[model samples]
Target: GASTTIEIASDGENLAYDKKEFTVPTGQTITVTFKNTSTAQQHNIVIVKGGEDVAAKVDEEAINAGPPDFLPADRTNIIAATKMLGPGGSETITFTAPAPGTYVFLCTYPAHYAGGMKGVMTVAP
Candidate 1:
């Protein structure tokens, strides 16, 4: 079984992720479970296309996309994402390890992106 599962959570009430980085070998399925441990507030894990440029564009569009879901309509510059989850809520997302490159992942709840709810995932070659 050339696959891996990852579990990450929000750092209490802070607008930040519990882990800042993760790595997985390419050519296998990956499972990521995001749990919002905050006392208040919602969070989601959005894996974007590339670096800051695409991430910013993706987040802005997600903001405009609104509630029920904060992802862009076309998923432009987005690789994968989870639905926003409230405190103590959790969601599991599955995807294959990307082409051996780094991807930017963040939370797109209003100002959560810049509030420090962000991290990176690296796909090993």
Candidate 2:
């Protein structure tokens, strides 16, 4: 299978991911590049297992982790992630797509998800 590249930028001022949805083929490797275009705060991207309630679970895990990035040590639901990016910073993550489904990518920074810093990644057969 071929690989895909997805670029998602942070809307620093508005606290949001630049794109709401993107798609890739299942079983292929994906290169996700997250750009932090915000001078106000840092941001990172975490891809979690598919489902509507997944974000809530991530939030809980994040709160428990606390400080420095807010990502759980176990990473129970996380599939892949990019490290926290500061102003004008960026990071790339390479991961094989999970089963064909709609997964979520979000910012684990405090209150950022609630602030709408999230998006969908659809994997198709």
Candidate 3:
């Protein structure tokens, strides 16, 4: 197993994460650096159980949360995430890649995932 550090720069086009899919060995610490390049729209990085499109559904739910941009952490979906950030803002978090499976990461902001702001994290042996 090998460790990896990834930097994901966001440009507001529903953009973030390096690869649409990636693999990390079990017990490997994964460091993700998310940088927001959009001033108008706020963005954040959220990780959910692999293989499930919970992130997409989050986008749908977040859109209806109304203003003040808040995350519904009580939804039993998010595994790890950073604070919602606006343009020029960024957040970094570390997590050990879980067992082995296909996990998803994306912005939970309204219309984000549908706009193509999503990525996959594959944890494998």
Candidate 4:
């Protein structure tokens, strides 16, 4: 299938995404649709070029930043973002895949990411 669409959802009230990871090709347009299936928690998605540690780092900055989106003003290592979504809300964003590497997909709505709303995106060289 020639589709570059990626669909991921939040595990209801679990503070987590349904899928752990996905892969895409470098230098191509990638569309990611994030669905918030959470029955109560609101969340957001930030894509970056690292692992859990880096996600924590970003999460820290996001804790004080964000008017609601929970994303650092400087943007940090973010490659893409799906800003703040409430229960059952959904958002879609598209961006070009960067060089082959590991990218973490996480929720930085305060302690959300630490609670386990994290995933990975792999771009092969």
Specify the highest-TM-score model's number.
Answer: 1
lDDT of 1 by residue, 1-125 (tens): 22379889999999999988888788788899999999889899999978777888888998998997788988667767899998899999988777888888999998999898999888788
Against the hidden reference, what TM-scores do the models get? 0.93, 0.92, 0.79, 0.91
In order of TM-score, best first, we have 1, 2, 4, 3
Candidate 2 per-residue lDDT, tens place, 1-125, comes to 22488888987677798898888889888898988998878899999987659877986788688877788887679989877777898999998888998898888888888888888888888
Candidate 1 matches the true fold with a TM-score of 0.93
Clashes of each: 0, 0, 2, 0
lDDT of 4 by residue, 1-125 (tens): 22368899988788788988888888899999999988788888899768777887888888888667878887658889988999989999999988888889899887888788898898877
| Candidate number that wins on TM-score, 1 or 3 | 1
Where does candidate 3 have its weakest 10-residue lDDT segment? 11-20
Look at candidate 1 and give me any clashing residue pairs.
none
**Candidate 2 TM-score to native:** 0.92
Model 3 bad stretches (over 4 Å): 12-18, 64-69
Candidate 4 Cα errors over 4 Å, as ranges = 1-3
How many collisions between residues are there in candidate 4?
0
The whole-model lDDT of each prediction reads 0.87, 0.84, 0.72, 0.85
